[PDB]
Design a protein around this ligand. Sequence first.
Ligand SMILES: *[C@@H]1O[C@H](CO)[C@@H](O[C@@H]2O[C@H](CO)[C@@H](O)[C@H](O)[C@H]2NC(C)=O)[C@H](O)[C@H]1NC(C)=O
Ligand SMILES: *[C@@H]1O[C@H](CO)[C@@H](O)[C@H](O)[C@H]1NC(C)=O
Ligand SMILES: *[C@@H]1O[C@H](CO)[C@@H](O)[C@H](O)[C@H]1NC(C)=O
Ligand SMILES: *[C@@H]1O[C@H](CO)[C@@H](O)[C@H](O)[C@H]1NC(C)=O
Lengths: 168, 168, 168, 51, 108
Amino acid sequence: AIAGFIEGGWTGMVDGWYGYHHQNEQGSGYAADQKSTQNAINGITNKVNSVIEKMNTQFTAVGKEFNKLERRMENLNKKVDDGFIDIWTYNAELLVLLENERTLDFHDSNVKNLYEKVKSQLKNNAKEIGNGCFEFYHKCNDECMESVKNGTYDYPKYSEESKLNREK
Amino acid sequence: AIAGFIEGGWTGMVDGWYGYHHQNEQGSGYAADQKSTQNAINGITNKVNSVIEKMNTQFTAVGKEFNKLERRMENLNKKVDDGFIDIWTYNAELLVLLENERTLDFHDSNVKNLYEKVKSQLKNNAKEIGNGCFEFYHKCNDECMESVKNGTYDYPKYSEESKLNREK
Amino acid sequence: AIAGFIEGGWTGMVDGWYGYHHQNEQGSGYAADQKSTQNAINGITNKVNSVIEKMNTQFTAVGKEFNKLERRMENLNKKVDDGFIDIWTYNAELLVLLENERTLDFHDSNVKNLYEKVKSQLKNNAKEIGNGCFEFYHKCNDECMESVKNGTYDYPKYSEESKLNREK
Amino acid sequence: DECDAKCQTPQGAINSSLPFQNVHPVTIGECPKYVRSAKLRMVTGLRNIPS
Amino acid sequence: YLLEDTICIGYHANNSTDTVDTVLEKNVTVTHSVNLLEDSHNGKLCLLKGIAPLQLGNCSVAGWILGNPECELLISRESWSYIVEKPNPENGTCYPGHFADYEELREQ
Ligand SMILES: *[C@@H]1O[C@H](CO)[C@@H](O[C@@H]2O[C@H](CO)[C@@H](O)[C@H](O)[C@H]2NC(C)=O)[C@H](O)[C@H]1NC(C)=O
Ligand SMILES: *[C@@H]1O[C@H](CO)[C@@H](O)[C@H](O)[C@H]1NC(C)=O
Ligand SMILES: *[C@@H]1O[C@H](CO)[C@@H](O)[C@H](O)[C@H]1NC(C)=O
Ligand SMILES: *[C@@H]1O[C@H](CO)[C@@H](O)[C@H](O)[C@H]1NC(C)=O
């Protein structure tokens, strides 16, 4: 999907993350699907907040000073300080790598699902032509268009209207 | 799938996690697919056991008491105790958040796969009607039904029997 | 997919991870899809390197020796050493369990995608017969074969050539 | 012994290239982290299902 | 009745008896893997970053440093990466008494 069957992104769509591009007798337009976009925005925000806000820290002075006859305590203390840095540096680096892959995978599954929505309504009332592009076998108005978007698309009202141009 | 194309769950199915609802001349029934259900039960149990059992702890007394001329050691010790609480609280909170999402995603992929099994056997011997509902173009008996379940469904034995009612 | 609809693996394919088996008038062959294979090899290697290389350690002597009037320090030190072992043992065991499942899931999604590539080009110029097996409705030469592989497959050049044997 | 290491254990030296070891908790050097684990194996390839 | 021309998609297999565990399954045999856990030592007291340790034989740090008559270690070393002492050395403070800040000296 993302850099897959749908090769690139639209600099034309500025109202969301995932959406559509329609062209008809009335004109062409870029429209973001505000339901999949919002659920993705909320979801990711949650992931981020969890990574930031879960890190709660109390007031603490890390540094400890020892005398020349306290080398063991000095080192015990270095062992603590370094052990914690080792853990946080490893965990933090790896968490980010893992959940960055997860975020990217999540967007991909949302565009593949947004596609399947449109494919499910327009069963054979349209043709799979380009990347995420569908070619209507009927005249789809600025009305029928904005109806494919909110999923309230009427299949019969254009079912037979398609059949004529279809067989041809 | 889960709260997606299959909107809700069955309070009627009490024998499993994922399953089917059949209705024919004989009657209607709720039957859980005991193979996908068991593999999901075993798998999740494993995830849980891993989270609980991997935490092995030896006998230890956390507390240390210091004198008024041991404030550095007292604080060194607080630094240890707090550093460990910080790590476990962050790790534990985040692991649960991440793997709860993973569990929920896993169920969704199992119901989408259980659906595709039924769709693969009943190629055009049935019609995709509702959510995860399939409408038979032939007379499917309590025999043919219990055969779609265990995947031993006979496509030809009902292939032509469907064709008659199909074209209509 | 992996141990799913494609039941097993090929001991015959030794040039990659995912690939194809073709048989025609010229002969049969095992050919690995070198693009999906390489991206999987690079990707996994990265995961592994991240797990190994991110663990950077400085020079350190863990051991500390105390006297009979230093039992608290001795124990403070045991608390540190054990707390770190507890964390690393839990984290390491769980990371491996989680990302081993993730790796296995990743291969499965690559073979399911390699399949969908072939299914997308050979729309109805072939038939879904076995596991990941496709049965050509036309004569596909050592040329047309090696063309399904690199995705430069010509649908029209065999579109009508299939139609004849198809209706039959 | 004349051998050269990056990590020394009370019972002998260890290969320090891996991130973890279950040999000994008390070491000297640039050492893998001690773990109580018996196995820590990461799958790279596919499930081996050849029959 | 017959089988025409085919293309089959699939995956690799081999003689590998390697097994892994996942968060959902145990003892999964796999084609290729990687061990992350070091479970083997050479059984030798090697050099550390090019420098050899200080073997004390039957002497303790005290015995060696004070110059106990049973400690000498012939024409002696001028640099060492770590110290090697026996679990219980038998040559230390031959004349009894208290060694002040001994664990500190040992560390230094
Ligand atoms: C150095 O260590 C040796 C070995 O433990 C000591 O030798 C022992 O001395 C006693 C003296 O009463 C003898 O009875 C034992 O037979 C000796 N043991 C062995 C194994 O030879 C010796 O005392 C130590 N020397 C100094 C100066 O500390
Ligand atoms: C050290 O470990 C790495 C990775 O396990 C391996 O490639 C290398 O050959 C090992 N070397 C020795 C001397 O054991
Ligand atoms: C793992 O499975 C193999 C067979 O696939 C078997 O030979 C082996 O004993 C199993 N190991 C355990 C510990 O169950
Ligand atoms: C140490 O003492 C043992 C006998 O207890 C003896 O065999 C050995 O040679 C002594 N010297 C060294 C350097 O270990």
